[PDB]
Amino acid sequence: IPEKLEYFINKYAEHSHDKWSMDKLANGWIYGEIYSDSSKIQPLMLLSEKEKEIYRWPIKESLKTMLAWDLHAMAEMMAENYHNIWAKKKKLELESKGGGNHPLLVPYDTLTAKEKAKDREKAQDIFKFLQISGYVVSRGXXXXXXXXXXXXXXXXXXXXXXXXXXX
């Protein structure tokens, strides 16, 4: 991973702090040493240091997938990556601790439309952040051609018919 993409990661972490601070001041949250949710005190002014640093990994994982692997297609692809890793984690841990079946034990096509927006929100956020910098990524006539192919096939068929008539 290049240090330019490291700069981009630091800029993303900055702007996520920035948008979370917009939310924090819109809801009027204040800082405090004690952790609580009803008394309106937070040690990073509900989210903890660990709660924020756990968001560090999935961005790098998505970058690895994107570099190893139109805009809406890539958005759906990133959403599918997130949903697939979530399904993998919950499936392995279900098989581990003997948990009950979840309603999300189905492929991504049979799913409904709300979890779509679930996985598309943060995808669209990350994709906006990618497209502000300038960094362009991708996946990595026809009728005439079809007519020509049909003509070739017809010619071959005519040749075969001539051969059969000769036979």
Curated annotation (Swiss-Prot):
Tissue: Highly expressed in heart, lung, cerebellum and brain. Detected at lower levels in adrenal gland, stomach, thymus, esophagus and ovary.
PTM: Channel activity is modulated by phosphorylation. Phosphorylation is increased in failing heart, leading to calcium leaks and increased cytoplasmic Ca(2+) levels.
Disruption phenotype: Embryonically lethal. Embryos die at about 10 dpc, due to defects in heart tube development. Cardiac myotubes display enlarged rough endoplasmic reticulum and cytoplasmic vesicles that contain high levels of Ca(2+).
Cell location: Sarcoplasmic reticulum membrane
Record's signal peptide: none
Sequence repeats by residue range: 70-140
Record note on domains: The calcium release channel activity resides in the C-terminal region while the remaining part of the protein resides in the cytoplasm.
Family statement: Belongs to the ryanodine receptor (TC 1.A.3.1) family. RYR2 subfamily.
Role, per record: Cytosolic calcium-activated calcium channel that mediates the release of Ca(2+) from the sarcoplasmic reticulum into the cytosol and thereby plays a key role in triggering cardiac muscle contraction. Aberrant channel activation can lead to cardiac arrhythmia. In cardiac myocytes, calcium release is triggered by increased Ca(2+) cytosolic levels due to activation of the L-type calcium channel CACNA1C. The calcium channel activity is modulated by formation of heterotetramers with RYR3. Required for cellular calcium ion homeostasis. Required for embryonic heart development.
Subunit structure: Homotetramer. Can also form heterotetramers with RYR1 and RYR3. Interacts with CALM and S100A1; these interactions regulate channel activity. Identified in a complex composed of RYR2, FKBP1B, PKA catalytic subunit, PRKAR2A, AKAP6, and the protein phosphatases PP2A and PP1. Interacts directly with FKBP1B, PKA, PP1 and PP2A. Interacts with FKBP1A and FKBP1B; these interactions may stabilize the channel in its closed state and prevent Ca(2+) leaks. Interacts with SELENON. Identified in a complex, composed of FSD2, CMYA5 and RYR2.
Name of the protein described by the UniProt record: Ryanodine receptor 2
Part of the whole protein covered: 2712 to 2905 of 4966
